[PDB]
């Protein structure tokens, strides 16, 4: 199960001179390709811990809380729209992709860190006739707003796991793309169409009026036009 340093993904931005073997992300909320391990986050990125032993010491000492709860696994997968709380420093980070296509932290405040946006991949009726939604991180949230459909974004309180607000998939809404050649791009969508012998294709317009087309499962509605619910890094 040993993953090579060259075989490590480009999203992590590791230093190749560091070691022979890259960390392998554990099973968890996000898939292995778009995950970012906590050891990579703390050691190679935040430079807090110099080596994996004191990375394990930190994650023992429970300063690092991921999405509210406390994780002690060194290779715990932390992914897109994940809030990491370092309680000793009182600094909160939100993981967002860079425009070039790599992971990046964002310094966020406390009341921003209190909520998290998730893409509703499933809407279904569970047992005893209880509706539920399955978000992109794997969360199952009971009793949603009946207006919530597939590919809509829900703002989730971290303390309770409850949906406060939601954004509907609609033309002229600021979405974010999370896959493919277009990865790391922020833009409002022109439209959505069906591709013959293919899938739903979404046409998105950037700030500089450039048009780029991607898969339906790749998009992520971060907010409506002119009001992003989350903070965004400099450079748009």
């Amino acid at each position: 199960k040993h993953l090579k340093r060259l075989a490590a993904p480009h999203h992590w931005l590791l230093d190749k001179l560091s070691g022979c073997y890259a960390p392998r992300p554990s099973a968890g909320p996000h898939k292995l390709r778009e995950s970012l391990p906590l050891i990579v986050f703390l050691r190679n990125r935040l430079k807090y811990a110099l080596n994996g032993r004191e990375v394990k010491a930190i994650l023992m000492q429970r300063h690092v809380k991921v999405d509210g709860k406390v994780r002690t696994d060194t290779t715990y997968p932390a992914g897109f729209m994940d809030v990491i709380t370092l309680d000793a420093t009182n600094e909160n980070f939100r993981l967002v992709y860079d425009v070039k296509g790599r992971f990046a932290v964002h310094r966020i405040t406390d009341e921003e860190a209190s909520y998290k946006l998730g893409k509703v991949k499933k809407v279904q009726l569970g047992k005893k006739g209880v509706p539920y939604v399955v978000t992109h991180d794997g969360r199952t949230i009971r009793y949603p707003d009946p207006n919530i459909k597939v590919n809509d974004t829900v703002k989730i309180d971290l303390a309770s796991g409850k949906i406060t607000d939601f954004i509907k998939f609609d033309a002229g809404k600021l979405v974010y793309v999370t896959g493919g050649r277009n990865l790391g791009r922020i833009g409002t969508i022109v439209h959505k169409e069906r591709h013959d012998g293919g899938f739903d294709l979404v046409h998105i317009k950037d700030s500089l009026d450039n048009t780029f087309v991607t898969r339906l499962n790749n998009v992520f509605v971060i907010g409506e036009q002119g009001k992003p619910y989350i903070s965004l890094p400099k450079g748009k």
Binding site: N182, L183, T214
Partner: peptide
């Protein structure tokens, strides 16, 4: 007739050197 829709690390990485 098919679009790949893949991130390209070769395209993303700097190659001016």
């Amino acid at each position: 007739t098919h679009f790949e829709d893949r991130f390209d690390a070769r395209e993303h990485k700097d190659r001016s050197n």
